[PDB]
Design a protein around this motif. Sequence first.
Motif, PDB file in Angstrom:
ATOM      1  N   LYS A 236       4.910  -2.053 -15.214  1.00 41.33           N
ATOM      2  CA  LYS A 236       3.457  -2.193 -15.310  1.00 41.33           C
ATOM      3  C   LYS A 236       2.862  -2.949 -14.121  1.00 41.33           C
ATOM      4  O   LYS A 236       1.785  -2.598 -13.638  1.00 41.33           O
ATOM      5  N   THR A 237       3.557  -3.987 -13.657  1.00 41.16           N
ATOM      6  CA  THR A 237       3.077  -4.765 -12.519  1.00 41.16           C
ATOM      7  C   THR A 237       3.218  -3.917 -11.251  1.00 41.16           C
ATOM      8  O   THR A 237       2.434  -4.042 -10.306  1.00 41.16           O
ATOM      9  N   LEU A 238       4.223  -3.048 -11.246  1.00 41.65           N
ATOM     10  CA  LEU A 238       4.458  -2.160 -10.114  1.00 41.65           C
ATOM     11  C   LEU A 238       3.258  -1.220 -10.014  1.00 41.65           C
ATOM     12  O   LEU A 238       2.697  -1.026  -8.938  1.00 41.65           O
ATOM     13  N   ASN A 239       2.865  -0.642 -11.146  1.00 42.23           N
ATOM     14  CA  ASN A 239       1.735   0.273 -11.165  1.00 42.23           C
ATOM     15  C   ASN A 239       0.449  -0.436 -10.754  1.00 42.23           C
ATOM     16  O   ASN A 239      -0.381   0.131 -10.040  1.00 42.23           O
ATOM     17  N   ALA A 240       0.288  -1.677 -11.211  1.00 41.50           N
ATOM     18  CA  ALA A 240      -0.897  -2.459 -10.884  1.00 41.50           C
ATOM     19  C   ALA A 240      -0.947  -2.702  -9.384  1.00 41.50           C
ATOM     20  O   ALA A 240      -2.004  -2.619  -8.767  1.00 41.50           O
ATOM     21  N   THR A 241       0.210  -2.991  -8.803  1.00 41.41           N
ATOM     22  CA  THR A 241       0.301  -3.247  -7.372  1.00 41.41           C
ATOM     23  C   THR A 241      -0.181  -2.036  -6.584  1.00 41.41           C
ATOM     24  O   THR A 241      -1.003  -2.163  -5.678  1.00 41.41           O
ATOM     25  N   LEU A 242       0.337  -0.862  -6.939  1.00 40.83           N
ATOM     26  CA  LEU A 242      -0.028   0.382  -6.271  1.00 40.83           C
ATOM     27  C   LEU A 242      -1.521   0.664  -6.414  1.00 40.83           C
ATOM     28  O   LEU A 242      -2.166   1.145  -5.485  1.00 40.83           O
ATOM     29  N   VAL A 243      -2.070   0.364  -7.583  1.00 41.63           N
ATOM     30  CA  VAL A 243      -3.491   0.579  -7.816  1.00 41.63           C
ATOM     31  C   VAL A 243      -4.296  -0.371  -6.936  1.00 41.63           C
ATOM     32  O   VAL A 243      -5.277   0.032  -6.310  1.00 41.63           O
ATOM     33  N   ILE A 244      -3.864  -1.629  -6.887  1.00 37.68           N
ATOM     34  CA  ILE A 244      -4.533  -2.660  -6.100  1.00 37.68           C
ATOM     35  C   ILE A 244      -4.438  -2.397  -4.594  1.00 37.68           C
ATOM     36  O   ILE A 244      -5.364  -2.704  -3.835  1.00 37.68           O
ATOM     37  N   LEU A 245      -3.323  -1.825  -4.159  1.00 33.84           N
ATOM     38  CA  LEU A 245      -3.145  -1.539  -2.741  1.00 33.84           C
ATOM     39  C   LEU A 245      -3.656  -0.138  -2.409  1.00 33.84           C
ATOM     40  O   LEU A 245      -3.450   0.371  -1.310  1.00 33.84           O
ATOM     41  N   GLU A 246      -4.333   0.471  -3.377  1.00 36.94           N
ATOM     42  CA  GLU A 246      -4.911   1.800  -3.212  1.00 36.94           C
ATOM     43  C   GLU A 246      -3.887   2.869  -2.840  1.00 36.94           C
ATOM     44  O   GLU A 246      -4.046   3.570  -1.839  1.00 36.94           O
ATOM     45  N   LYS A 247      -2.840   2.993  -3.652  1.00 35.81           N
ATOM     46  CA  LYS A 247      -1.798   3.991  -3.420  1.00 35.81           C
ATOM     47  C   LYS A 247      -1.817   4.990  -4.564  1.00 35.81           C
ATOM     48  O   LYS A 247      -1.097   5.986  -4.545  1.00 35.81           O
ATOM     49  N   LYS A 248      -2.649   4.705  -5.562  1.00 37.79           N
ATOM     50  CA  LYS A 248      -2.814   5.564  -6.732  1.00 37.79           C
ATOM     51  C   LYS A 248      -3.876   4.970  -7.653  1.00 37.79           C
ATOM     52  O   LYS A 248      -4.640   4.093  -7.246  1.00 37.79           O
ATOM     53  N   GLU A 249      -3.924   5.447  -8.894  1.00 38.42           N
ATOM     54  CA  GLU A 249      -4.889   4.941  -9.863  1.00 38.42           C
ATOM     55  C   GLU A 249      -4.230   4.896 -11.240  1.00 38.42           C
ATOM     56  O   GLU A 249      -3.075   5.357 -11.348  1.00 38.42           O
TER      57      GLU A 249
ATOM     58  N   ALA B  37       8.323 -10.278  -8.830  1.00 42.83           N
ATOM     59  CA  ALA B  37       7.739 -10.943  -7.675  1.00 42.83           C
ATOM     60  C   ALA B  37       8.262 -10.354  -6.371  1.00 42.83           C
ATOM     61  O   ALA B  37       7.486 -10.083  -5.454  1.00 42.83           O
ATOM     62  N   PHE B  38       9.573 -10.156  -6.279  1.00 43.17           N
ATOM     63  CA  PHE B  38      10.139  -9.602  -5.057  1.00 43.17           C
ATOM     64  C   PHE B  38       9.630  -8.182  -4.814  1.00 43.17           C
ATOM     65  O   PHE B  38       9.233  -7.839  -3.700  1.00 43.17           O
ATOM     66  N   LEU B  39       9.628  -7.357  -5.856  1.00 40.60           N
ATOM     67  CA  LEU B  39       9.168  -5.977  -5.708  1.00 40.60           C
ATOM     68  C   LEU B  39       7.730  -5.917  -5.191  1.00 40.60           C
ATOM     69  O   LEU B  39       7.434  -5.148  -4.270  1.00 40.60           O
ATOM     70  N   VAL B  40       6.843  -6.721  -5.777  1.00 47.45           N
ATOM     71  CA  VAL B  40       5.448  -6.757  -5.343  1.00 47.45           C
ATOM     72  C   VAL B  40       5.377  -7.153  -3.873  1.00 47.45           C
ATOM     73  O   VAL B  40       4.708  -6.496  -3.078  1.00 47.45           O
ATOM     74  N   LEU B  41       6.071  -8.229  -3.516  1.00 39.03           N
ATOM     75  CA  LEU B  41       6.085  -8.707  -2.142  1.00 39.03           C
ATOM     76  C   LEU B  41       6.664  -7.640  -1.208  1.00 39.03           C
ATOM     77  O   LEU B  41       6.129  -7.395  -0.124  1.00 39.03           O
ATOM     78  N   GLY B  42       7.749  -7.005  -1.648  1.00 45.40           N
ATOM     79  CA  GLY B  42       8.391  -5.964  -0.860  1.00 45.40           C
ATOM     80  C   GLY B  42       7.441  -4.821  -0.557  1.00 45.40           C
ATOM     81  O   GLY B  42       7.310  -4.388   0.588  1.00 45.40           O
ATOM     82  N   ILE B  43       6.774  -4.324  -1.592  1.00 42.87           N
ATOM     83  CA  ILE B  43       5.824  -3.234  -1.426  1.00 42.87           C
ATOM     84  C   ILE B  43       4.734  -3.633  -0.422  1.00 42.87           C
ATOM     85  O   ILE B  43       4.342  -2.825   0.427  1.00 42.87           O
ATOM     86  N   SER B  44       4.261  -4.880  -0.506  1.00 45.47           N
ATOM     87  CA  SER B  44       3.223  -5.358   0.402  1.00 45.47           C
ATOM     88  C   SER B  44       3.708  -5.349   1.851  1.00 45.47           C
ATOM     89  O   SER B  44       2.901  -5.382   2.780  1.00 45.47           O
ATOM     90  N   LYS B  45       5.024  -5.309   2.049  1.00 45.66           N
ATOM     91  CA  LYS B  45       5.575  -5.277   3.401  1.00 45.66           C
ATOM     92  C   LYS B  45       6.000  -3.868   3.829  1.00 45.66           C
ATOM     93  O   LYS B  45       6.553  -3.681   4.912  1.00 45.66           O
ATOM     94  N   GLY B  46       5.750  -2.878   2.976  1.00 41.88           N
ATOM     95  CA  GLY B  46       6.098  -1.514   3.322  1.00 41.88           C
ATOM     96  C   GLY B  46       7.253  -0.877   2.575  1.00 41.88           C
ATOM     97  O   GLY B  46       7.566   0.283   2.813  1.00 41.88           O
ATOM     98  N   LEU B  47       7.900  -1.625   1.687  1.00 39.08           N
ATOM     99  CA  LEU B  47       9.012  -1.093   0.902  1.00 39.08           C
ATOM    100  C   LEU B  47       8.591   0.245   0.291  1.00 39.08           C
ATOM    101  O   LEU B  47       7.594   0.312  -0.432  1.00 39.08           O
ATOM    102  N   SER B  48       9.337   1.309   0.574  1.00 40.94           N
ATOM    103  CA  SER B  48       8.970   2.623   0.045  1.00 40.94           C
ATOM    104  C   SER B  48       9.652   3.058  -1.251  1.00 40.94           C
ATOM    105  O   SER B  48       9.284   4.075  -1.823  1.00 40.94           O
ATOM    106  N   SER B  49      10.615   2.276  -1.728  1.00 41.00           N
ATOM    107  CA  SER B  49      11.323   2.600  -2.969  1.00 41.00           C
ATOM    108  C   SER B  49      12.250   1.456  -3.357  1.00 41.00           C
ATOM    109  O   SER B  49      12.409   0.494  -2.605  1.00 41.00           O
ATOM    110  N   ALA B  50      12.875   1.575  -4.526  1.00 38.67           N
ATOM    111  CA  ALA B  50      13.805   0.556  -4.997  1.00 38.67           C
ATOM    112  C   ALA B  50      14.682   1.033  -6.150  1.00 38.67           C
ATOM    113  O   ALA B  50      14.234   1.779  -7.022  1.00 38.67           O
ATOM    114  N   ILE B  51      15.943   0.617  -6.137  1.00 39.62           N
ATOM    115  CA  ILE B  51      16.842   0.966  -7.225  1.00 39.62           C
ATOM    116  C   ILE B  51      16.505  -0.167  -8.182  1.00 39.62           C
ATOM    117  O   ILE B  51      16.790  -1.334  -7.909  1.00 39.62           O
TER     118      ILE B  51
END
Length: 559
Positions: free
Chosen positions: A546-559, A522-536
Motif C-alpha cells: 500500500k505504501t508502495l502504491n502511495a509512493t508511485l501515486v505521489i511521484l506521479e507514476k500512476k494513480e 522505508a528502504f523501498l520508498v527511498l529506493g524508488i525516489s532514487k530511481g529503483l525500477s523494481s524489487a524482489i
Amino acid sequence: MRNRREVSKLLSERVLLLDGAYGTEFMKYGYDDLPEELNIKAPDVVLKVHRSYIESGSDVILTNTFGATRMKLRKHGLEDKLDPIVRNAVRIARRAAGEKLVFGDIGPTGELPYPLGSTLFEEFYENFRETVEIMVEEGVDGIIFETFSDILELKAAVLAAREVSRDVFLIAHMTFDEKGRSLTGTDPANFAITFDELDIDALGINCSLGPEEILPIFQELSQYTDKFLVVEPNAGKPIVENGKTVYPLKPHDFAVHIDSYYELGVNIFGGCCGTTPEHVKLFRKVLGNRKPLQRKKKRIFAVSSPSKLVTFDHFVVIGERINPAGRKKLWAEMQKGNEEIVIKEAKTQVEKGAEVLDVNFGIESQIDVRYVEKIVQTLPYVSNVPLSLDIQNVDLTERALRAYPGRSLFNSAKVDEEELEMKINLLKKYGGTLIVLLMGKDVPKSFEERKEYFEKALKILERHDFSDRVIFDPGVLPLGAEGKPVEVLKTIEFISSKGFNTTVGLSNLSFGLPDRSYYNTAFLVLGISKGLSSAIMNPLDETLMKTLNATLVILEKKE
C-alpha cells in the motif's frame, strides 16, 4: 542444399513468393486422405500439386509434412511411417522445384505443454529433432515451423532444429486469433521479443485470419524484430456454405493486399487456407521483382510469459515468496515434489500485485530436476506471469532456461568473469535477461566499491554485447552487518542515472531484526525516489504494498 547464409543473401535482394494450400488441392483431385499419407499412397498427387505451384511462379514450395512428427502421426497409427513419409515428401518436392527453393514444413504436434497438456519440453524437443534430421539429410533449403499456437512448443522446435544444423535457414511462425493472441495468450510483440533473440533467421504469421485482419498484427510483429519476415494469410474470412467452411477471397482481392505487407517490410509472401494455384499466379504478377524494405526495430527491456509481457517502464514488483529459505513447510513440500503448494504461492502473490515471480529451490542438490522443470513450465501458464529464475547450479540453470515458456529474468550473476560469461552464453542460447549482482569475491562496504563492481561488470557485458539485457542489483546488506543502506541508495541513483534498470533483494535489509516490514517499507520508498525500477519483495506485506502504491501515486507514476 543451400544454407542460411545463401538464403539470407537472396532475401536481402528480393521478396520471395511461397506456394498455397495443399489439402484442398488434394481434395479437388479426389483425395481426402491424410495429406502426409499421400507421400506414400499417391506421390503422383503430391508432385502434381507442387508443380501447379512452381508453374504459378513460386520461388519456394513447402514439403507435404505439416503433421509429419512422431507425436502427431501416432494419432493416426502412422508413427512408424515417419521416415518414408518425410523422405518421400522432400524427394517429391525436390523433383518438382528443380532449381527453386524447398523448405521443410513442420507444424505443431497438437499436444499442449504440461501443465495444460502432459508434455514436457524434452519430449517436444526430441520429437522435432527427428523430423529435422530427416529433412536436413534429404537436402531442404530451409525449415519453416508453421502455425504454432504456443511459444514453449515453438521454442522446443527451433532449439531442436538449430541443434541438428547450425546452417539451415530457420523460420518460426505463430498463428493469432482475431484478437491478436495465440491459443495460449501470446501477442505479436511478445512473440517477436521472445524469439528475436533466438538463433532463427525469420519470423512470421500464417493462417487463422485473412489479409486485412493480419495487417495490424504483422505490423506489431515487424516493429520488434529485425529478422526476415514472412506472412501467409488465409484467403479472406471463412464462410460456411454447403455445410462446409470455405475461404472465398478471389485472387485479385487477395493480391491487392501485397503492397501493404511489402510496405511493412515483408520478405516472403504466401497464402494459407483457400489459397490456390490461381491465387499464386496473380501474386507472382503483382509481386514482381522487388528489393525488400529496411525497417529498424524498436528496442525495449521486457520479460515474458505465454500470456503476459512485462516491460520495465514502471516499477515492477517481483514476488519473493517461492523460496524455501527459512520456510520449513515449503521446503519439505518441494522435496516431496508438491506442485500445488507452489502454484498457490504464485497465484496469491500475483493476486496481490506481483507482476513477476522469483522462483528458487533452496538446496538444489536435494530437489528432483523433473519437479523443477514441471514448476518452471507450470507457473507462467497458471499464474499468468513471467518468472525470475533464482537458480545457482549451472546444470539446473540450463534445464530451467530451455524449458521456460517465454523470455525470463535470470536471478543474479556475480561480477566474476567466469560466472558472467558462462551465464551470458546460456542466456544468448536460450533467451532471457540477467540480474547482475554487484559483488564478487566478497561484499562491498561502500558506494565506491559498488561503483567499481558496476564498472567492471559493464566492461564484461560490453565485450559480450549484452549490455542491453541486464538489471543491476546493488546488493542490499543486513542492518545487522553495518550494511550501510545509504551506500546502496547512492549506487541505485548512480546506476539509474546511467540508464540501467535496477532491483534489490529487499528483505535482506531486515533479515536479522524485528519490525522488518517497516525497514523494508522505508528502504523501498527511498529506493524508488532514487530511481529503483523494481524489487524482489513480499507482495503479501499489505503495509509495504500500500505504501508502495502511495509512493508511485505521489511521484506521479500512476494513480
